Design a protein around this ligand. Structure first.
Ligand SMILES: C[N+](C)(C)CCO
Ligand SMILES: C[N+](C)(C)CCO
Ligand SMILES: C[N+](C)(C)CCO
Ligand SMILES: [Ca+2]
Ligand SMILES: [Ca+2]
Ligand SMILES: [Ca+2]
Lengths: 517, 512, 517
């Protein structure tokens, strides 16, 4: 009765590239086939445009202000329930292959098994410090060297990572298929979390070649000069060391080309996973979700990467396909915060069991024609912020607030590229009432003073602790997968014939000319 | 310049047994000689009368309301600085041998090396539930079978543990001595944390025999009937399943006898540590601390173990000896909360570096004759509480508050056994104004409604997660001491003569 | 400098299926391409028709009587030099992905790194016992259930293993390519050792479908009844529990069809390795060997699997390709015993440094047109033998001796299918004199009484020890691969940009130190 759940997650995928499933110009036949049978959430947003905050929030269905994972080095408490816990409590086998950027000594956070280590660190090294506004840390900050460095390679740090993530996810699916004839097996939930299309913007030749004739290599909004940028965008450019890189038109085109090429790299791995589900005969009983942690400005407005609430950074794709999911396109804004309650709903878990632990809403009713009215909230409190920023997405509007900056208000229906800041330049009385309305809702959801103080305390505490932990012998927190070789394959407490039968799936099949095995 | 630091910690040691170092009737020659040499804090209290809360608070110098380690299964966040971090940041090698009842995947919390696993669990299993007031969990709650089951054995779970804690601590001291002649060495801080004299009250014959003629086998206050007990004591007796145990006078004597015997068992281990320091020539450069996480009523008032603020449960000894420490007896109340700022002060760390992270005060000024006026605060929010309790200890007074119970106010100078509740029976207008003053102080320090809400959220959260974590394959968080065999002793990337010389200490010695 | 060496090994591959590279009827485009550019040894033999003895002898270039690895449970001493030692001593990084059926607590035998555990046991469980002739051990002996159970499945024990073997082999090549521009790098030798096409004869549907119209699904020589079999064949059929299986023609076809399908399964993995070598720019400096431990009778004569000296069981392919290797087909008999001295010769190691440690001869002279006259020797002393057997292969002749059985003498020129035993039915005085000459050679090479005594002592010794080791807590010897997660990918003792550059290969436009092609 309970469906299997395959979560396919990718990193830094601009949601505007999924207008209705993948954009037509992308070479993504597998993701395009998946989308045609999916509920597709067009205006879907991350909870925070940064990896560890987005992913802790994604796992728990809680905003960063609640998980306390403010930045890429903030400890994620083991006691915070995640969709892994909820599903595991409900009888699921739960596994992760790939990245989740969990910081702290808990590298599972409810997952029963984790098949790879993380690509990124698990310690407090990347802790920002609001006491030194304007500083940058060159050994890990984003810099525009990813833009000037884009190109072609046959292996990279990330391609090693994702190649392994995919192999072990498919291996696990093959292993799980051996139970497929047991009606009393546990349903499974496998999260497969790739690091592409995150930079470096570097792609295998095969996929780079797919985009030789690409007509989407120019961003839709050109570079805004530093002196004309809004303050947060200015902070982002300084954090990227913009003044020490000469980003040419060609650099922009090459970066976008490798990025699209790495989507096609991912599409092939999506196809592998679907193929494994199909041939092992678990496709029809498996829900498939496609999601990402945050987007990438990809040169739009002159900006790259994330760390802001503009569409290209804050929007991320979201699709759900499988049993009991009617395909279609949904335009109401939604959030990564809705994924954990949606997963619980699809798993048969009652609303009361998840209500105290989740800040979002289930999307299943929406899949079934029921309007969703809840606004979308977002937060940011890491590098290139000197104080926290919050945003609200509701109806056609986006509102952004930072105690240090002028407000931003965008009418995304009329101004999808967010070129006109209606808080600075209100069109009339309705714009003014709308700003008051969003100010009141902002004040209702966030105490920005308490938010700042909480972030400063978290940073300061971690810097004392991390300074200590980097003296003397280092104790690493990186997850080490363990697959006991002494229990695998054939060992001499076993019966070879029984082993071979148990590891074969499907079983008892095979006919040359006499079609009964 | 920076001294070495040896912290010796024991578990469940009633502080009333250290009036001026160990009480006369205890066979504790090694701890008595240490005490003559130490600043001794007579009226020292734990921050919380329970293992994990007291220990998380002890390491951080923060109360449970700040660490959020409310009970024996509450997660201790890795990001909370401890004295291990403070000393490590300042250039110390830091190590732990033995118990600290850290809950969560971090089993070091700043310690650079940990030589043993913990005796107790590292996961959320022992999480209380304020939604079910009155329940008890038989498979891990205290029960008076410790009292009826006291006796003599040559090995126990705890004796295996402590024998190993002791061996590895002395081994580590020996290993450290090999750097003692190196001017570029780091100073070291070794915490040696024993589980005795925590129950089961079971002792080796050798130490049991020391107390054949002991005159302290009867508690000073007898069993108070359930009807006549204060509400919290009633909760504790119910949690101990008291209705199903017939505790006789013999049981009480046998339990106390084994407890004293296990203090003597520890005293021999204290002697071993000091002997190693002496023969390795590290004694004179080493501060030595003696401390405990909480006490044990030991049958006084009819109660056993801890979980309350009465003297026998809330008082724990505290002594400090070594370079720059004037010996003496101090009567002003102190707290385990003061240990971390004291350690930092002794180690040369500035007050500013530790002020944002510690709720207590350094005891070094007191050691040097400066009056200390800060009150001592305590908290409890675990088994046998249905709502959090707080306590204030200041001057001659102890005040205890729980939203569910009548207040308690004791004048410990006039009523050292806390037999007269002056909140209930004021002696006069000074007692009345004193109660009002402590009420005002409590309200200024604690939002008790927020406290209860925070504890309930922590409990609920953990029960969701722990139920999940006990489905399928279990991933344990217990500490596994580091594996290092390929780098130990003689291996063929090394020169044998160089090895022998480096591992020999003292060096160049001998006299025929 | 010295060349890289990729050793592609497969298990239980009947050498008659590679008459000149792969037979025409096989779907094996990658191995046929490889064969076209290789020196191909048509009449190449295993040293012992069984996995562990063949593989210990292969690694050492020593016969079983010298390695003392007589059977699948015999300890292989760590002190015995292997091609891994020889190459590693000469400056090579050496690695193994996959199977080598090493028995004993040493699971590396000179390999610097092993990327997978073994599919098979590493302890003394499978020790035969000459004190009980006629017994069989049902929980691990071969049985004709492989033939009756042949068919189609998408995962098996062996495809899980070989999928993993392949993935990690290709990953290791990618990792090694990152050193390819460093002139201080070590040359590398990677052995990729697959368990297919060993039974179970079970194949993925994709590859099974390739052999729908196959014309080779029935053996040329059909089943010989027990009462007309030679004694050793009779012992093999009894060991296979042949009396309890009804092997139909359809069963024979299904088994051969799956077997061929698994050759095609392996051919796709060969193409994968070649593709990785090509795109990493490592192909042109890489010697590629293709080899197998023993063959598979595949129903010929009514026999299945190995354990004998007939062509289908004793012949295994051998090809060598790469720098300095002239392609060609060689008909002089060779042996797996020659691989280790050939590898050393090709790696630039002098003959004097390997001569005291190998029984075989380098094939490099033969590749360069020098005649080879050394005979090919083989030994067997495991299951289905009640006493050791030896064989001599020289010129057109094969001679087989066992103290318990009539001699066999075959003229492979006139009788390629070994249907006429010329020791029993000589054609004339030349056949008679040839038998005497092989008798004298046999007596000069082997003391068969001593051989039997040595195998009996080895068996008895292991059974005493194994009986003890299976009491109480078991201590496994299985190899546990370890890739330390605390040193992989991004960790906060590193600079992220330095990391990315080091892990990117090839290093072209956009990389730190590429200024031109
Ligand atoms: C991804 N970086 C590590 C480059 C910066 C944090 O987003
Ligand atoms: C586990 N016990 C409850 C028995 C002791 C800790 O309080
Ligand atoms: C391969 N078996 C394990 C089936 C028997 C030994 O060759
Ligand atoms: Ca990310
Ligand atoms: Ca305790
Ligand atoms: Ca084999």
């Amino acid at each position: 009765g309970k469906p299997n759940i395959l979560i396919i997650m990718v990193d830094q995928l601009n949601g505007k590239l999924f207008p209705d499933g993948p954009a037509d110009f992308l070479h993504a036949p597998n993701l395009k086939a998946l989308a045609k049978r999916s509920a597709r959430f067009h205006n879907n947003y991350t909870s925070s445009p940064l990896s560890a905050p987005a992913r802790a929030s994604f796992m728990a269905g809680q905003l960063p202000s609640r998980t306390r994972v403010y930045d890429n080095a903030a400890e994620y408490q083991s006691s915070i329930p995640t969709y892994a816990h909820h599903l595991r409590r409900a009888g699921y086998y739960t596994a992760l292959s790939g990245k989740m950027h969990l910081v702290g000594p808990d590298q599972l956070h409810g997952f029963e098994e984790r098949l790879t280590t993380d690509i990124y660190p698990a310690d407090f090294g990347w802790t920002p410090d609001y006491r030194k506004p304007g500083e940058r840390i060159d050994w890990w900050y984003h810099n525009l060297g990813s833009v000037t460095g884009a190109g072609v390679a046959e292996i990279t740090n990330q391609m090693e990572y994702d190649d392994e993530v995919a192999f072990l996810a498919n291996q696990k699916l093959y292993q799980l298929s051996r139970e497929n004839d047991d009606e009393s097996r546990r349903p499974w939930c496998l999260t497969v979390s790739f690091t592409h299309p995150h930079d470096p913007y570097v792609a295998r030749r095969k996929f780079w070649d797919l985009y030789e004739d690409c007509e989407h290599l120019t961003p839709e909004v050109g570079a805004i000069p530093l002196d004309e940028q809004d303050p947060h965008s200015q902070r982002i450019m300084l954090s990227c060391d913009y003044q020490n890189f000469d980003v040419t038109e060609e650099n922009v085109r090459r970066s976008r080309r490798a990025y699209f090429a790495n989507i096609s790299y991912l599409d092939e791995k999506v196809g592998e996973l679907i193929d494994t589900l199909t041939r092992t005969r678990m496709l029809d009983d498996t829900l498939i979700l496609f999601c990402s942690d945050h987007g990438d400005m990809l040169g739009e407005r002159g900006l790259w990467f994330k760390m802001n609430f503009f569409e290209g950074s804050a929007r991320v794709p979201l699709m759900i396909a499988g049993p009991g999911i009617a395909p279609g396109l949904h335009l109401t804004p939604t959030s990564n915060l809705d994924v954990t309650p949606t997963l619980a709903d699809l798993a048969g878990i009652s609303l009361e069991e998840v209500r105290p632990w989740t800040d979002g809403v289930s999307l299943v009713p929406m899949v079934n024609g029921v309007e969703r009215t809840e606004p979308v909230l977002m937060e940011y409190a890491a590098e290139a912020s000197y104080a926290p920023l919050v945003a609200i997405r509701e109806g056609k509007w986006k509102y952004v607030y930072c105690a240090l900056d002028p407000e931003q208000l965008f009418d995304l229906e009329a101004d999808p590229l967010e070129l006109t800041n209606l808080a600075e330049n209100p069109r009339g009385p309705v714009d003014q009432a709308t700003l008051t309305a969003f100010r009141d809702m902002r004040a209702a959801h966030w105490d920005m003073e308490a938010f700042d103080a909480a972030v400063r305390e978290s940073q300061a505490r971690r810097w004392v602790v991390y300074e200590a932990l980097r003296n003397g012998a280092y104790y690493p927190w990186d997850h080490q997968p363990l697959q006991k070789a002494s229990e695998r394959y054939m060992r001499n407490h076993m019966n070879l014939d029984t082993l071979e039968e148990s590891k074969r799936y499907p079983r008892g099949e095979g006919s040359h000319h006499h079609h009964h095995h």
